[PDB]
């Protein structure tokens, strides 16, 4: 995940405040911050006076102060606040635009932008044009992955995928194949997929006539809630209207026909931030339509099915004959060696199977689960929750095709005494952050959490 939050903090402070002028956007990004920061912000919003940091430390007890660091580093990075070395102390307070916009949103503010929605006869049926939006999303997914016939006409969308290098396909030859980007597209189910696409549209649509403030206003207003009436009519900038038309082309806007009406709030914009239910000529069975099979025997057990979905499954397993409920496919080391040819890491697939194909493995994941977490301390043996036998086989295949071991972090030094190194190592073992250590060399290549906590302890 490119973690759009990182993109959010990427933009400078003045434009951040530009965005914070739009209260609905303020709320939508409030939805994203880690819970610690959420609570702290909600605290600060009302008492119209800065607050020293010491209190905001003593608020949080131990075993969790790491979340304290997470929150403060995030918020400082995106500069929602302004730390103030007023008297040499720390006088925290938010970007006042943020505070006023948020407080307005909570109690009937003047955010005409967030209130851009119009209430009228929303004759839009649930299935009504919802099926059309789902079909458009499926069509673009298949065309990008590459179907037998890809009717994807998103010339702008195709240009975004190509120039963005969405998938390792030869767009010069018209190929839309799975690259590392293509593999990720195969990985990020909905929020991941929609998010990567939104970021791509951002990067490509960033040169001229952007009005990024209006861009995000439009995006989140789409994600905020059903604007309905007068949306496409009134509630949009000129470039805002163009971007809205483009998004509606991209599926993410379920605008009706006639090319002039209120905003058509497709479920997709909801799907942008919901992290919830994923379900979308006129036939759509109401059930976990996802269909596949993955168990200890390393085989496909598909009774339910979905064409692009089963094709995704095939992207790492052989196909011989599609059947009525089943498709001929058996998952083996060679099956994943097919994707290893693309070099796709056996990482996204793990959580994918834990999440996707569960519409056909509900009972499987339940019997694996068995609520063996509260029962874990009593019965020390977990009952194959998130099957680790297959996990071991997959890891074995990955190593066999891998032959290389890598680690993240940075080299560390200036461990002058063995006492500090040993205490830091013990602390890291307590927190499980030390990949490897040695007092003889006083060096290692791990995450920065232990150094951060020791530095915070020393300085304050």
């Amino acid at each position: 995940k490119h973690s759009v939050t990182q993109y959010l903090e990427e933009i400078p402070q003045q434009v951040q405040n530009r965005l914070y002028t739009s209260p609905a956007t303020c709320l939508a990004i409030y939805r994203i911050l880690p819970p610690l920061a959420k609570f702290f912000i909600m605290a600060m919003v009302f008492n119209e006076n800065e607050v020293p940091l010491l209190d905001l430390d003593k608020w949080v007890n131990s075993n969790g102060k790491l979340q304290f660091q997470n929150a403060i580093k995030s918020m400082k990075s995106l500069h929602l606040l302004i730390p103030n070395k007023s008297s040499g102390t720390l006088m925290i307070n938010l970007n006042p635009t943020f505070k006023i916009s948020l407080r307005n949103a909570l109690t009937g503010g003047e955010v005409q932008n967030s209130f851009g929605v119009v209430v009228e006869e929303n004759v839009v049926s649930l299935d009504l044009l919802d099926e059309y939006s789902a079909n458009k999303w499926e069509t673009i997914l298949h065309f990008m992955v590459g179907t037998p016939l890809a009717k994807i006409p998103s010339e702008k969308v195709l240009n975004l995928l190509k120039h963005s290098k969405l998938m390792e396909e030869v767009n010069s030859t018209g190929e839309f194949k799975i690259t590392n980007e293509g593999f990720q597209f195969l990985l990020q189910e909905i929020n991941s997929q929609l998010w990567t696409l939104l970021l791509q549209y951002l990067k490509m649509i960033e040169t001229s006539k952007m009005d990024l403030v209006d861009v995000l206003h439009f995006i989140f207003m789409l994600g905020a809630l059903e604007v309905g009436k007068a949306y496409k009519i009134d509630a949009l900038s000129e470039t805002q209207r163009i971007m809205l038309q483009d998004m509606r082309d991209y599926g993410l806007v379920f605008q009706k026909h006639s090319n002039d009406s209120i905003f058509y709030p497709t479920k997709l914009a909801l799907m942008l931030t919901s992290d919830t239910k994923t379900i979308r000529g006129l036939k759509n069975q109401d059930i976990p339509d996802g269909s596949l099979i993955v168990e200890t025997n390393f085989k496909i057990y598909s009774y339910s099915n979905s064409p692009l979905q089963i094709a995704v499954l095939s992207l790492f397993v052989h196909l011989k004959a599609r059947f009525v409920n089943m498709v001929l496919g058996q998952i083996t080391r060679e099956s994943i060696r097919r994707a290893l040819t693309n070099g796709i890491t056996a990482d996204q697939i793990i959580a994918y199977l834990e999440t996707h194909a569960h519409p056909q493995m509900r009972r499987l994941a339940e019997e694996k689960l068995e609520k063996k977490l509260e029962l874990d301390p009593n019965c020390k043996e977990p009952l194959q929750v998130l099957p680790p036998t297959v996990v071991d086989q997959i890891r074995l295949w990955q190593l066999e095709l891998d032959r290389v071991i890598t680690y993240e972090g940075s080299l560390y030094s200036d461990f002058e005494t063995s006492q500090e190194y040993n205490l830091l190592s013990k602390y890291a073992q307590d927190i499980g952050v030390l990949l490897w250590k040695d007092d003889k060399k006083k060096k290692f290549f791990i995450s920065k959490e232990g150094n951060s906590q020791v530095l915070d302890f020393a300085k304050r």
């Binding site: 032959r403 290389v404 071991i405 890598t406 680690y407 993240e408 972090g409 940075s410 080299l411 560390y412 030094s413 200036d414 060399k441 060096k443 290549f445 920065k448 150094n451």
Partner: protein, 66 residues
């Protein structure tokens, strides 16, 4: 604030030496060789290092699969 970034490489010393040879063949992009079990490299050329490693292993072993 001391933190030395780069493509850390950790493997067996034999493969370490082989990778050092390969890297020297491609103009020695290895930033550092921390010890017999760790190397610090610039990530820019690690990909072509892996590519040439694949090329030479295919040349030598050829995978008879007999």
């Amino acid at each position: 604030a001391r933190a030395r970034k780069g493509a850390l490489v950790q493997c067996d010393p034999s493969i370490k030496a082989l990778i050092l040879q390969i890297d020297a063949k491609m103009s020695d992009i290895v930033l550092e060789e921390l010890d017999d079990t760790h190397l610090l490299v610039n990530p820019s050329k690690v990909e072509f290092v892996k590519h040439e490693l694949n090329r030479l292993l295919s040349k030598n072993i050829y995978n008879p699969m007999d």
